Amino acid sequence: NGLTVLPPLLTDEMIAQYTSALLAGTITSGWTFGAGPALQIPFPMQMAYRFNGIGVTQNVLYENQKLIANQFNSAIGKIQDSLFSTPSALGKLQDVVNH
Amino acid sequence: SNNSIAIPTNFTISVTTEILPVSMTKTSVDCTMYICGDSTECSNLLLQYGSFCTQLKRALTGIAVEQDKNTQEVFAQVKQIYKTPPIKYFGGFNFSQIL
Amino acid sequence: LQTYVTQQLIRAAEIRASANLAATKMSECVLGQSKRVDFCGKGYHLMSFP
Amino acid sequence: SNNSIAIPTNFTISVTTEILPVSMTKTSVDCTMYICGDSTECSNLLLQYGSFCTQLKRALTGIAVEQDKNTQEVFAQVKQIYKTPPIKYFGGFNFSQILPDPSKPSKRSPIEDLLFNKVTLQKFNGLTVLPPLLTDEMIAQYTSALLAGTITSGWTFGAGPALQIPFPMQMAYRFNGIGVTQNVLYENQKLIANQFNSAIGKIQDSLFSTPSALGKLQDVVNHNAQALNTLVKQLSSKFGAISSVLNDILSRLDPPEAEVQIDRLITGRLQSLQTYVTQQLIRAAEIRASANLAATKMSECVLGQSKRVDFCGKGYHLMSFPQSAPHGVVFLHVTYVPAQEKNFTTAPAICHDGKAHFPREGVFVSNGTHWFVTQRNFYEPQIITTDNTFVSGNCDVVIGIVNNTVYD
Amino acid sequence: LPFQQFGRDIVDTTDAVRDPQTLEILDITPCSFGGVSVITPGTNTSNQVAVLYQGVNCTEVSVAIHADQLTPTWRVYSTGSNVFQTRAGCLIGAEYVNNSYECDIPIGAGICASYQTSQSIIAYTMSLGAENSVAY
Ligand SMILES: *[C@@H]1O[C@H](CO)[C@@H](O[C@@H]2O[C@H](CO)[C@@H](O)[C@H](O)[C@H]2NC(C)=O)[C@H](O)[C@H]1NC(C)=O
Ligand SMILES: *[C@@H]1O[C@H](CO)[C@@H](O[C@@H]2O[C@H](CO)[C@@H](O)[C@H](O)[C@H]2NC(C)=O)[C@H](O)[C@H]1NC(C)=O
Ligand SMILES: *[C@@H]1O[C@H](CO)[C@@H](O[C@@H]2O[C@H](CO)[C@@H](O)[C@H](O)[C@H]2NC(C)=O)[C@H](O)[C@H]1NC(C)=O
Ligand SMILES: *[C@@H]1O[C@H](CO)[C@@H](O[C@@H]2O[C@H](CO)[C@@H](O)[C@H](O)[C@H]2NC(C)=O)[C@H](O)[C@H]1NC(C)=O
Ligand SMILES: *[C@@H]1O[C@H](CO)[C@@H](O)[C@H](O)[C@H]1NC(C)=O
Ligand SMILES: *[C@@H]1O[C@H](CO)[C@@H](O)[C@H](O)[C@H]1NC(C)=O
Ligand SMILES: *[C@@H]1O[C@H](CO)[C@@H](O)[C@H](O)[C@H]1NC(C)=O
Ligand SMILES: *[C@@H]1O[C@H](CO)[C@@H](O)[C@H](O)[C@H]1NC(C)=O
Ligand SMILES: *[C@@H]1O[C@H](CO)[C@@H](O)[C@H](O)[C@H]1NC(C)=O
Ligand SMILES: *[C@@H]1O[C@H](CO)[C@@H](O)[C@H](O)[C@H]1NC(C)=O
Ligand SMILES: *[C@@H]1O[C@H](CO)[C@@H](O)[C@H](O)[C@H]1NC(C)=O
């Protein structure tokens, strides 16, 4: 009756490219690419840096590398299942559409 | 007690989620097609109510422009599109669920 | 019409508050390590993924 | 790669800007003058509508008081009023572009002067504009006090009594804060001073050439002007009556017939005021959020060093300086950016005599033949002694451990 | 041009006319108006008040006091140190000292009023703060 809806400037494919860029930069560089040029560093050393940041010495990580890696992988597998089960998990995003 | 303490001897890794809205739907509305439609007589009567609809158009257009700005500020943080190496070994960590 | 437009203006201000908070969490939890308690999760923060 | 690291060998000092609105225009309204005027017949019909007008005056008055609290919350961060020393020598650093110049009568810095020459670009119907409580000269005194306190004291004046300290030592403290040892600054004091001075000079030309630099402060000036013009032009709309003049229809019309005509004009003009007041309330809320953010940046970037990423400028924060603009404030963020990286080969630990060795504060690195330990933000190799490593373990569990010699 | 009658501004309000008797162009300016404020201390303390005429010159008010103003609630008169002109309006009923204290009752562009000790209402200039200088 005189009402129109306009499409967003960024398509849903373009947005997903930005998220891929952030993931690739935070895996191979850490927090270096947020300040200046991206700098190489192996991943376990980044986790040692982060244990130092939270206040635990480096040797804790290196002597428990396998245990921590298994815990990280298992903890992210449950993310999918918790999303399948609960249908009201995305209440906030669904609330915007209905309003 | 003033001579006792508790110190942890083990740890665990946990992953949590957080959902945040960013933008909403962009709409535009036309007065004459809505209030009157195609009736010319109604258009003349609506004409002599000052500049109400000029205000409605400007109000709704300002909202539409902001919706593109919100997504630009959240995702478009880095100006370099990084790419992950073809081989996906990261010291035992498994990122296959998010890449 | 005026009632509809006025409601949208108030809603948009609420969205900006959420969008600004999201843009802050990306700078401090994703592009760095945050020492603010309970800002980027419960516990001692390590990293984040969007 | 899982055995390759990159480490910078040089840096760069950069200065950016940030513009934030702090307050907008204060206004007042008068019902009877705007709606009826000098017509006594109209004012008798208006009082049948009750206390609509008392609500409108309350709404605008509340906004006006809030504007004065927005300015007081940003600049009035200092109890004292510090003054710059008579001799302007700070170990090679130049501050002539930000400190006030006595030659100008208003005592405003050269950067502050050109800001006032760009954004700067009686009554009608009882709509009046009230003046802000704090004058422009008073605001610049607050800014000068903040600048003179962060130069001769650092961050100590933001927590209690102000304690003086030489400027290079303050910069060494801030380098320690960002994570680079003191000896880097002292051995490169002359070069760092030259880099900072060049960055300041580009600020003046950056604002000269760029037209859309002060675009955020310009919008609030034009938005408040448009609303008043739209409000005044609504006085010449028929709204469905014979004419748009009160006494013109008063004369050539039947006295009961003219009663319903005045009703249309009054209802139309009441609706115009409701639209204006409601619009200002929403805009005032948006400005208040901006003023609250500017108060946080003043307390966290100017009176101290912040470790929040991307909060006080891109890079690693060092310090900040405030500048005053009409209806706003401008920040000058000084940051530290690495440059000139290089390939390297790294290992997690060093094995010697059956014992593992981890660095204290550094990362192990090899140039091809010899292994060194260096800080993780500036290439500065050192010999691997026992005063920079701790054994803490055995040479059997760590993955990727290499073995070398450690000189005790 | 010798066919037009009256002029209009941007907001479509008459601001110039032409006399029909003798062809001459006249300007039109509205008669002065503005808000009125009352400055009082606690009524539990005293009964004196000070009046502020927002956005108007002091000479215009004094001239119009001669039975030509639409507010009979007038002050006593220009008894020497009562008429002080500020950037906000013609303040009547307060004496302007040349000292400086912290603000107590905001008035306008850097001017405040307070009840200081006989007893009277005084207007001064707001003091930013206690001065200091660090020996660098
Ligand atoms: C610290 O906790 C971890 C798990 O949180 C323990 O690892 C578990 O050990 C038991 C016994 O060998 C196994 O059955 C589990 O499968 C292990 N967990 C995982 C995820 O593999 C570890 O033993 C604890 N350490 C101490 C010293 O108590
Ligand atoms: C990372 O995790 C994924 C998800 O579990 C692994 O992919 C699974 O591998 C098993 C074993 O071959 C299969 O039975 C599953 O079907 C796979 N999942 C899917 C969705 O196909 C993957 O192997 C892990 N990464 C590595 C290097 O092992
Ligand atoms: C780090 O970078 C600075 C910035 O270019 C270098 O300073 C220049 O050095 C060259 C050669 O020594 C001089 O010709 C230039 O005049 C210097 N520029 C300035 C602005 O002074 C510095 O040499 C670099 N340091 C290293 C170790 O490479
Ligand atoms: C700090 O920088 C200013 C700006 O460059 C210097 O002032 C300049 O000095 C040179 C040398 O006399 C003159 O040629 C310029 O005309 C000056 N510019 C201005 C805008 O006055 C100032 O000398 C520097 N401070 C010190 C101590 O040298
Ligand atoms: C990790 O190191 C091993 C040698 O221990 C090497 O074979 C492998 O290629 C490395 N990973 C990558 C991704 O290059
Ligand atoms: C580091 O090594 C990579 C691998 O080839 C190379 O592309 C890069 O240019 C090197 N870095 C520098 C600063 O030369
Ligand atoms: C690597 O470091 C050693 C130790 O000083 C040095 O002798 C050698 O020349 C260096 N190699 C290169 C290519 O500079
Ligand atoms: C030292 O390291 C080499 C290879 O990294 C290994 O072959 C050798 O056995 C190590 N030394 C000892 C004493 O184990
Ligand atoms: C009207 O009469 C006056 C009388 O002084 C005269 O000056 C004027 O010229 C007359 N109007 C015209 C248009 O001549
Ligand atoms: C007020 O009137 C006096 C004398 O008429 C004049 O000197 C002064 O400039 C006037 N003030 C303003 C603001 O016009
Ligand atoms: C107040 O003192 C100042 C500075 O001495 C002076 O200029 C001013 O005339 C004084 N006010 C008077 C005397 O009313």
| 3-class state of residue D153 by DSSP | coil
The closest of D325, D269, D262, D261 to D294, measured between CA atoms, is D325
Are C33 and A31 in contact, with CB atoms under 8 Å apart? yes
State whether B24 and C11 contact (CB < 8 Å).
Answer: yes
Question: What does the DSSP assignment read for D169-237?
Answer: HHHHHHHHHHT--HHHHHHTHHHHHHHHHHHHHHHHHHHHH-SSSSHHHHHHHHHHHHHHHHHHHGGG-
What is the resolution in angstroms?
Answer: 3.2
User: Minimal Cα–Cα distance from B66 to chain A, Å?
Assistant: 11
Rounded Cα gap, residues D157 and A67, in angstroms = 49
End-to-end CA distance of chain C: 39
| Angle, alpha carbons D221-D227-D231 (nearest 5°) | 150
Rounded Cα gap, residues D279 and D227, in angstroms = 9
State whether D122 and E33 contact (CB < 8 Å).
Answer: no
A3: β partners: B29
Rounded Cα gap, residues D274 and D34, in angstroms = 13
Are E50 and E39 in contact, with CB atoms under 8 Å apart? yes
Tell the burial category of E32 from Cβ atoms under 10 Å away from its Cβ (0-12, 13-18, 19+): middle
CA distances from D241 to B40, D39, D236 (A): 20, 17, 12
State whether A2 and B33 contact (CB < 8 Å).
Answer: yes
State whether B66 and C31 contact (CB < 8 Å).
Answer: no
CA distances from D182 to D316, D318, D360, D389 (A): 16, 14, 17, 21
Chain D residues within 8 A of C13 when measuring between CB atoms: 282, 285-286
CA distances from D150 to A5, D84, D158, D322 (A): 52, 10, 9, 11
Q: What tokens appear for D347 in the block?
A: 């290992």
The closest of D25, D237, D34 to D124, measured between CA atoms, is D34
Rounded Cα gap, residues D90 and E136, in angstroms = 10
The closest of D368, D371, D348, D369 to D359, measured between CA atoms, is D348
Rounded Cα gap, residues D248 and C7, in angstroms = 39
The closest of D313, D297, D316, D309 to D174, measured between CA atoms, is D316
Q: What tokens appear for D138 in the block?
A: 């008073």
Q: Which residues contact B1 (CB under 8 A, 6 or more apart)?
A: none
Are D269 and D244 in contact, with CB atoms under 8 Å apart? no
Tokens 């006006």 locate to D64
Q: At what angle do helices D257-297 and D52-75 cross, to 10 degrees?
A: 20
Using CB distances shorter than 6 Å, the residues near ligand 8 are D 402-403
Rounded Cα gap, residues A1 and A4, in angstroms = 9
Q: Which amino acid is at C27?
A: S
CA distances from E83 to B18, B84, E65, E72, E104 (A): 64, 78, 13, 18, 20
D10: β partners: D339
Rounded Cα gap, residues D13 and E12, in angstroms = 56
CA distances from D195 to D172, D177, D202, D218, D399 (A): 16, 20, 11, 32, 43
Count of Cβ atoms closer than 10 Å to residue E132 Cβ: 16
| 3-class state of residue D329 by DSSP | strand
Rounded Cα gap, residues A24 and D397, in angstroms = 30
Chain E residues within 8 A of D236 when measuring between CB atoms: 12
Rounded Cα gap, residues D351 and D389, in angstroms = 11
Nearest CA to ligand 2 atom 8: B96
State whether B97 and A79 contact (CB < 8 Å).
Answer: yes
D357: β partners: D350
Rounded Cα gap, residues D220 and D70, in angstroms = 15
Tokens 């993924």 locate to C49
Contacts 24+ apart (CB under 8 A), D249-255: D250/D39, D250/D41
Q: Which amino acid is at D278?
A: T
Are there at least 3 beta-carbon pairs closer than 8 Å between A and C?
yes
Count of Cβ atoms closer than 10 Å to residue B41 Cβ: 8
CA distances from D307 to D170, D377, D401, E4 (A): 17, 16, 33, 70
Residue among B21, B56, B77 whose CB faces C15 most closely: B21
Q: Which residues contact D298 (CB under 8 A, 6 or more apart)?
A: D74, D75, D77, D322, D329
Count of Cβ atoms closer than 10 Å to residue A24 Cβ: 18
Gyration radius of chain A's alpha carbons: 20
Measure E18 CA to ligand 9 centroid, in angstroms.
13
Are D317 and D352 in contact, with CB atoms under 8 Å apart? no
| 3-class state of residue A83 by DSSP | helix
| 3-class state of residue D135 by DSSP | coil
| 3-class state of residue D297 by DSSP | helix
HEC assignment per residue over chain E: CCCCCCEECCCCCEEEEECCCCCCEEECCCCCCCCEEEECCCCCCCCCCEEEEECCCHHHHHHHCCCCCCCCCCCCCCCCCCEEECCCEEEECCEEEEEEECCCEECCCCEEEEEECCCEEEEEEECCCEECCCCC
CA distances from D97 to D110, D200, E4 (A): 6, 8, 56
Characterize the bridge pairing of strands E50-54 and E89-92: antiparallel
Rounded Cα gap, residues E3 and D122, in angstroms = 29
Q: Which residues contact D23 (CB under 8 A, 6 or more apart)?
A: D67, D70, D71, D132, D287, D291, D327, D328
Tell the burial category of A96 from Cβ atoms under 10 Å away from its Cβ (0-12, 13-18, 19+): middle
Are E97 and E86 in contact, with CB atoms under 8 Å apart? no
Find the length of chain A.
99
Rounded Cα gap, residues D153 and D166, in angstroms = 8
What is the greatest pairwise CA distance in chain C? 50
Please give the method by which this entry was determined: cryo-EM
Nearest CA to ligand 1 atom 28: B10
Gyration radius of chain E's alpha carbons: 22
Would you give the distance in Å from CA D176 to the centre of its chain? 25
Rounded Cα gap, residues E89 and E59, in angstroms = 11
HEC assignment per residue over B5-36: CCCCCCCCCCCCCCCCCCCCCEEEECHHHHHC
Rounded Cα gap, residues D318 and D13, in angstroms = 10
Are A45 and A32 in contact, with CB atoms under 8 Å apart? no
Could you give phi then psi for residue D268, rounded to 5 degrees?
Answer: -65, -40
| 3-class state of residue A5 by DSSP | strand
D359: β partners: D389
DSSP state at residue D359: E
Are D85 and D187 in contact, with CB atoms under 8 Å apart? no
| 3-class state of residue C6 by DSSP | helix
The closest of D370, D374, D380, D379 to D407, measured between CA atoms, is D370
Would you give the distance in Å from CA D344 to the centre of its chain? 40
Burial D18-52 (b: 16+ CB within 10 A, else e): bbbbbbbbbbbbbbeebbbeebeebeeebeeeeee
Residue among C26, C31, C50 whose CB faces A31 most closely: C31
Pocket test for ligand 10, best of E54, E59, E84, E91 (most atoms within 8 A of CB): E59
Rounded Cα gap, residues D142 and D147, in angstroms = 9
Tokens 């609509």 locate to D52
DSSP state at residue D255: T
| Ligand 5 atom, smallest distance to D2 CA | 1
What is the greatest pairwise CA distance in chain B? 91
Q: Which amino acid is at D17?
A: T
Tell the burial category of D67 from Cβ atoms under 10 Å away from its Cβ (0-12, 13-18, 19+): buried
Characterize the bridge pairing of strands E111-116 and E95-101: unpaired
The closest of D16, D26, D44 to D262, measured between CA atoms, is D44
Is the C-alpha dihedral spanning D305, D308, D312, D316 positive or negative? positive
Q: Which amino acid is at B1?
A: S
Could you give phi then psi for residue D336, rounded to 5 degrees?
Answer: -125, 125
Question: Is the C-beta atom of D9 inside 6 A of ligand 6?
Answer: no
- Which ligand has the nearest atom to the CA of D405? 8
User: Minimal Cα–Cα distance from B72 to chain A, Å?
Assistant: 9
Could you give phi then psi for residue A11, rounded to 5 degrees?
Answer: -70, 160
